[PDB]
Design an enzyme around this catalytic site. Sequence first.
Site, PDB file in Angstrom:
ATOM      1  N   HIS B  16       0.840  -1.189   0.000  1.00 54.30           N
ATOM      2  CA  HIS B  16       0.000   0.000   0.000  1.00 54.30           C
ATOM      3  C   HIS B  16       0.867   1.226   0.000  1.00 54.30           C
ATOM      4  O   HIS B  16       1.694   1.382   0.884  1.00 54.30           O
ATOM      5  CB  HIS B  16      -0.953  -0.040   1.192  1.00 54.30           C
ATOM      6  CG  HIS B  16      -2.167   0.846   1.020  1.00 54.30           C
ATOM      7  ND1 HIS B  16      -2.130   2.157   1.261  1.00 54.30           N
ATOM      8  CD2 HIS B  16      -3.453   0.561   0.585  1.00 54.30           C
ATOM      9  CE1 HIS B  16      -3.330   2.695   1.001  1.00 54.30           C
ATOM     10  NE2 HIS B  16      -4.137   1.715   0.580  1.00 54.30           N
ATOM     11  N   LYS B  24      -2.582   1.708  -6.360  1.00 51.84           N
ATOM     12  CA  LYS B  24      -3.050   0.626  -5.486  1.00 51.84           C
ATOM     13  C   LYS B  24      -2.522  -0.710  -6.019  1.00 51.84           C
ATOM     14  O   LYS B  24      -3.104  -1.275  -6.935  1.00 51.84           O
ATOM     15  CB  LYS B  24      -4.599   0.586  -5.441  1.00 51.84           C
ATOM     16  CG  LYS B  24      -5.275   1.922  -5.148  1.00 51.84           C
ATOM     17  CD  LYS B  24      -5.075   2.390  -3.715  1.00 51.84           C
ATOM     18  CE  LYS B  24      -5.705   3.767  -3.503  1.00 51.84           C
ATOM     19  NZ  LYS B  24      -5.440   4.311  -2.141  1.00 51.84           N
ATOM     20  N   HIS B 134       7.840   5.500 -16.141  1.00 51.94           N
ATOM     21  CA  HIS B 134       8.355   6.850 -15.840  1.00 51.94           C
ATOM     22  C   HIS B 134       9.712   6.917 -15.184  1.00 51.94           C
ATOM     23  O   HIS B 134      10.409   7.954 -15.248  1.00 51.94           O
ATOM     24  CB  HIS B 134       7.354   7.678 -15.009  1.00 51.94           C
ATOM     25  CG  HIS B 134       6.099   8.077 -15.756  1.00 51.94           C
ATOM     26  ND1 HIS B 134       6.125   8.727 -16.938  1.00 51.94           N
ATOM     27  CD2 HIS B 134       4.749   7.910 -15.429  1.00 51.94           C
ATOM     28  CE1 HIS B 134       4.860   8.970 -17.351  1.00 51.94           C
ATOM     29  NE2 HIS B 134       4.018   8.457 -16.433  1.00 51.94           N
ATOM     30  N   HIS B 171      -0.399   8.573 -19.990  1.00 57.17           N
ATOM     31  CA  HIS B 171       0.780   9.392 -19.763  1.00 57.17           C
ATOM     32  C   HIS B 171       1.866   9.076 -20.739  1.00 57.17           C
ATOM     33  O   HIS B 171       2.029   7.917 -21.146  1.00 57.17           O
ATOM     34  CB  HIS B 171       1.289   9.202 -18.341  1.00 57.17           C
ATOM     35  CG  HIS B 171       0.289   9.592 -17.281  1.00 57.17           C
ATOM     36  ND1 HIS B 171      -0.472   8.682 -16.626  1.00 57.17           N
ATOM     37  CD2 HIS B 171      -0.057  10.837 -16.767  1.00 57.17           C
ATOM     38  CE1 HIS B 171      -1.269   9.324 -15.752  1.00 57.17           C
ATOM     39  NE2 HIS B 171      -1.016  10.640 -15.841  1.00 57.17           N
ATOM     40  N   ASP B 258      -5.297   3.728 -17.410  1.00 51.59           N
ATOM     41  CA  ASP B 258      -5.686   5.097 -17.070  1.00 51.59           C
ATOM     42  C   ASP B 258      -6.130   5.916 -18.278  1.00 51.59           C
ATOM     43  O   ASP B 258      -6.495   7.079 -18.142  1.00 51.59           O
ATOM     44  CB  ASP B 258      -4.619   5.854 -16.250  1.00 51.59           C
ATOM     45  CG  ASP B 258      -3.226   5.812 -16.863  1.00 51.59           C
ATOM     46  OD1 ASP B 258      -3.036   5.323 -18.002  1.00 51.59           O
ATOM     47  OD2 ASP B 258      -2.297   6.279 -16.163  1.00 51.59           O
ATOM     48  N   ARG B 264      -9.382   7.739 -12.231  1.00 54.17           N
ATOM     49  CA  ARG B 264      -9.175   8.739 -11.174  1.00 54.17           C
ATOM     50  C   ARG B 264      -8.238   9.879 -11.592  1.00 54.17           C
ATOM     51  O   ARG B 264      -8.424  11.024 -11.178  1.00 54.17           O
ATOM     52  CB  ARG B 264      -8.697   8.045  -9.883  1.00 54.17           C
ATOM     53  CG  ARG B 264      -8.377   8.953  -8.692  1.00 54.17           C
ATOM     54  CD  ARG B 264      -7.856   8.123  -7.509  1.00 54.17           C
ATOM     55  NE  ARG B 264      -7.460   8.952  -6.368  1.00 54.17           N
ATOM     56  CZ  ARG B 264      -7.199   8.501  -5.141  1.00 54.17           C
ATOM     57  NH1 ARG B 264      -7.287   7.207  -4.852  1.00 54.17           N
ATOM     58  NH2 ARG B 264      -6.851   9.355  -4.190  1.00 54.17           N
TER      59      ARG B 264
HETATM   60  O1  LIG Z   1     -10.912   1.528  -5.173  1.00 56.87           O
HETATM   61  P1  LIG Z   1     -10.379   1.048  -3.861  1.00 56.87           P
HETATM   62  O2  LIG Z   1      -8.861   1.079  -3.837  1.00 56.87           O
HETATM   63  O3  LIG Z   1     -10.959  -0.243  -3.356  1.00 56.87           O
HETATM   64  O4  LIG Z   1     -10.811   2.135  -2.765  1.00 56.87           O
HETATM   65  C1  LIG Z   1     -10.473   3.506  -2.889  1.00 56.87           C
HETATM   66  C2  LIG Z   1      -9.531   3.937  -1.763  1.00 56.87           C
HETATM   67  O5  LIG Z   1      -8.306   3.204  -1.830  1.00 56.87           O
HETATM   68  P2  LIG Z   1      -7.818   2.069  -0.814  1.00 56.87           P
HETATM   69  O6  LIG Z   1      -6.603   2.667  -0.136  1.00 56.87           O
HETATM   70  O7  LIG Z   1      -8.969   1.785   0.129  1.00 56.87           O
HETATM   71  O8  LIG Z   1      -7.519   0.938  -1.753  1.00 56.87           O
HETATM   72  C3  LIG Z   1      -9.242   5.441  -1.877  1.00 56.87           C
HETATM   73  O9  LIG Z   1      -8.449   5.877  -0.780  1.00 56.87           O
HETATM   74  P3  LIG Z   1      -7.353   7.038  -0.873  1.00 56.87           P
HETATM   75  O10 LIG Z   1      -8.104   8.349  -0.847  1.00 56.87           O
HETATM   76  O11 LIG Z   1      -6.532   6.802   0.377  1.00 56.87           O
HETATM   77  O12 LIG Z   1      -6.678   6.822  -2.206  1.00 56.87           O
HETATM   78  C4  LIG Z   1     -10.545   6.250  -1.878  1.00 56.87           C
HETATM   79  O13 LIG Z   1     -10.235   7.616  -2.110  1.00 56.87           O
HETATM   80  C5  LIG Z   1     -11.520   5.799  -2.957  1.00 56.87           C
HETATM   81  O14 LIG Z   1     -11.019   6.085  -4.275  1.00 56.87           O
HETATM   82  C6  LIG Z   1     -11.776   4.304  -2.842  1.00 56.87           C
HETATM   83  O15 LIG Z   1     -12.655   3.924  -3.899  1.00 56.87           O
HETATM   84  P4  LIG Z   1     -14.249   3.775  -3.643  1.00 56.87           P
HETATM   85  O16 LIG Z   1     -14.344   2.702  -2.575  1.00 56.87           O
HETATM   86  O17 LIG Z   1     -14.757   3.388  -5.015  1.00 56.87           O
HETATM   87  O18 LIG Z   1     -14.700   5.119  -3.149  1.00 56.87           O
HETATM   88  K   LIG Z   2       1.372   6.565 -23.395  1.00 60.21           K
HETATM   89 ZN   LIG Z   3      -0.406   6.688 -16.589  1.00 61.08          ZN
END
Ligand SMILES: O=P(O)(O)O[C@@H]1[C@@H](OP(=O)(O)O)[C@H](OP(=O)(O)O)[C@@H](O)[C@@H](O)[C@H]1OP(=O)(O)O
Ligand SMILES: [K+]
Ligand SMILES: [Zn+2]
EC number: 3.5.1.98
Lengths: 69, 369
Positions: B16, B24, B134, B171, B258, B264
């Site tokens: 993490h 992630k 990168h 990117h 991406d 995101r």
């Molecule tokens: O898509 P995940 O990775 O399962 O979860 C992320 C979360 O990352 P995590 O550290 O829990 O894997 C993420 O946390 P951080 O703001 O710490 O990147 C949330 O913002 C949101 O995008 C969250 O997505 P959401 O549950 O779809 O809101």
């Molecule tokens: K590219």
């Molecule tokens: Zn990229």
Amino acid sequence: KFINMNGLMADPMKVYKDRQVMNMWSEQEKETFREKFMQHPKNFGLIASFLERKTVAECVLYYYLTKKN
Amino acid sequence: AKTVAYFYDPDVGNFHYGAGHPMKPHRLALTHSLVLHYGLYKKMIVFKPYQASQHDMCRFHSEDYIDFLQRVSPTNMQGFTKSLNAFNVGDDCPVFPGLFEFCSRYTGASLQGATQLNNKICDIAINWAGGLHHAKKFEASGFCYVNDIVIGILELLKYHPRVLYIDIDIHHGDGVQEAFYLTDRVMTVSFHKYGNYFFPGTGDMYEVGAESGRYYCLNVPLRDGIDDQSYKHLFQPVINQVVDFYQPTCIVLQCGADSLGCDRLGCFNLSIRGHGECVEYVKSFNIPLLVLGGGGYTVRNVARCWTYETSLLVEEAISEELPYSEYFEYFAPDFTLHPDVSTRIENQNSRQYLDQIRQTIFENLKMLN
Ligand SMILES: O=P(O)(O)O[C@@H]1[C@@H](OP(=O)(O)O)[C@H](OP(=O)(O)O)[C@@H](O)[C@@H](O)[C@H]1OP(=O)(O)O
Ligand SMILES: [K+]
Ligand SMILES: [Zn+2]
Ligand SMILES: [K+]
């Protein structure tokens, strides 16, 4: 038998399943994770430090396996 | 027909980057989960992968840089203030527990893939964990620490006179482009969002290579909101002519997710099907193929994109319905392989812009006959 000497996986599903079977968290462990988490959110280094038989990688895995349920 | 090697590391996802960080690693765990539950392993040779050492890494990266990646830890950072700044660690590239193990794990699989293609152990090698394009010789950049792509292409060059690198991440693939800018032995082709200081700020259409590498580097700079049909209209002609003119004996494809709608970080409007059309088109040339992951910051969509691309690479039509698994709830509310990821935001790539783009690209390509 399920993984060769050279890393060829004869049964990749069995290998994967094995990693889930080792979801052996006790209730003391489960509860410590939570309190340490809400205190330090996603500081898995800190969380793991308070868990005698859980490493930082197991903490990451537990977080993803449970954060919905 | 085609032998497909697939690298499955049960540990590579258990890291993490830190609170708030968009990268992630556990997106790799979701991907593997779906790939296995769909039964795709039945069509592939599945390896627990080699882990790369500093020796492997320092075929490209500097000794002190890699040394620092081993040494720095969340608990000792206070004494490394100058090194963090020098090596560009701490911001886009934070210090997290297991950082070096993660680098070793993703790099190793890229290198083993290159190795197996060299040895003709397979026709197509897949490492979704790799593609960190990168990273530079002595600095971290853009969530990437070790440039597993360059390390892997170095390995291919032992046997291959000409390697085509194709980069589909939103990117600009600057780290790979830099490493090979001065040579004609690797041709780097990158499609990317360019303009308004969108990271990394490079990959201008006039960046075509230097020295004997002049015209062996190609950049396709795009604006916000490119859709499937427009992307396909550029991608296929460009790649077709690149293959004809350059005649690569091996292709390396970085498949950053991406460039999908609703990413995101990204601002493109490609569907999972559109993104997969690129992978399948590269596959059609029947040239030995190393397939890497890369960016992808809507975890639920990334896992599905790469699962769907796996099924294409293996020539298997899998159901729209996701099979039940430990991560089933991540795919709510649709629980489908192909969710709607449309931005429903205006495409900023006008027909004029794309033709102005088209014409300079084909002019550059003329230089290779
Ligand atoms: O898509 P995940 O990775 O399962 O979860 C992320 C979360 O990352 P995590 O550290 O829990 O894997 C993420 O946390 P951080 O703001 O710490 O990147 C949330 O913002 C949101 O995008 C969250 O997505 P959401 O549950 O779809 O809101
Ligand atoms: K590219
Ligand atoms: Zn990229
Ligand atoms: K080049």
